[PDB]
Amino acid sequence: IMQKSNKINDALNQHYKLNVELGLVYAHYAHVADDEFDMPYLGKFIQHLSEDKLGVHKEYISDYFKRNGMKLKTDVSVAVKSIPSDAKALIQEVYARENEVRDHVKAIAKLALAEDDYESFYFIQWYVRDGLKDLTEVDDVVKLFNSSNDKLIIEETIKEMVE
């Protein structure tokens, strides 16, 4: 009498895929921030976000599926074929992707209510809140590039954020 929603199943499989692929992209951007742009703390901030997407962001869905009978799907393809031209544009790109996360998460909450899937509406509340948190942390680094022209000042300020 509690059959899982296929629509929610698909939307969460899509979101699983987004977090894997985002995490793989951020792992690359973390590398570039350190190696090419000489900003290892910016690299550490982005690497932390990468391990976040490839960790709890995907594991919570996988665990959730175990409990309710939804089917997990692993279908992944991502190629980092060009890189932003400097550190500001790099973190600006990360921002734009985190903003899209908020839009994807919102669609899932809306769908969960349309499906009368209150377990799924409960489960997604965490993503609803974290969408704004991850976006805010990234926004706190974007602001640094408009507040100083000095890479090492910026780096020094980031070091108190991923501490």
Backbone φ and ψ of 82, nearest 5° = -145, 160
115 binds, among Fe ion, a second copy, none (CB under 5 to 8 A by kind): none
Q: How far is the CB of 125 from a second copy (least distance, A)?
A: 6
Q: Which of 134, 154, 142, 124 is nearest to 48 (CA)?
A: 134
Q: How far is the CB of 155 from a second copy (least distance, A)?
A: 7
DSSP 8-state class, residue 35? H
Residues that bind Fe ion (CB under 5 A): 6, 35, 37, 52, 65, 80-81, 86-87, 130, 134
Distance, in Å, from the CA atom of 88 to the CA atom of 86, rounded to the nearest integer, reads: 6
Distance, in Å, from the CA atom of 137 to the CA atom of 13, rounded to the nearest integer, reads: 26
Our CB check for a second copy shows the closer of 6 and 140 to be 140
Per-residue b or e along 61-97, where b marks 16 or more CB atoms closer than 10 Å to that residue's CB: beebbeebebeeeeeeeeeeeebeeebbebbeebbeb
163 binds, among a second copy, Fe ion, none (CB under 5 to 8 A by kind): none
Q: How far is the CB of 121 from Fe ion (least distance, A)?
A: 19
86 binds, among a second copy, Fe ion, none (CB under 5 to 8 A by kind): Fe ion
Q: How far is the CB of 136 from a second copy (least distance, A)?
A: 5
Q: Which of 138, 56, 65, 38 is nearest to 97 (CA)?
A: 138
Residue 67 CA to its chain's centroid (Å): 24
Our CB check for a second copy shows the closer of 6 and 148 to be 148
Residues that bind a second copy (CB under 8 A): 1-2, 20-21, 24-25, 27-28, 31-32, 34-35, 38-39, 54, 58, 62, 65-68, 72-80, 99-100, 102-103, 105-106, 109-110, 113, 116, 118-119, 122, 125, 128-129, 131-132, 135-136, 143-144, 146-157
Task: Specify the residue for token string 């996988």.
Answer: 62
Our CB check for a second copy shows the closer of 89 and 153 to be 153
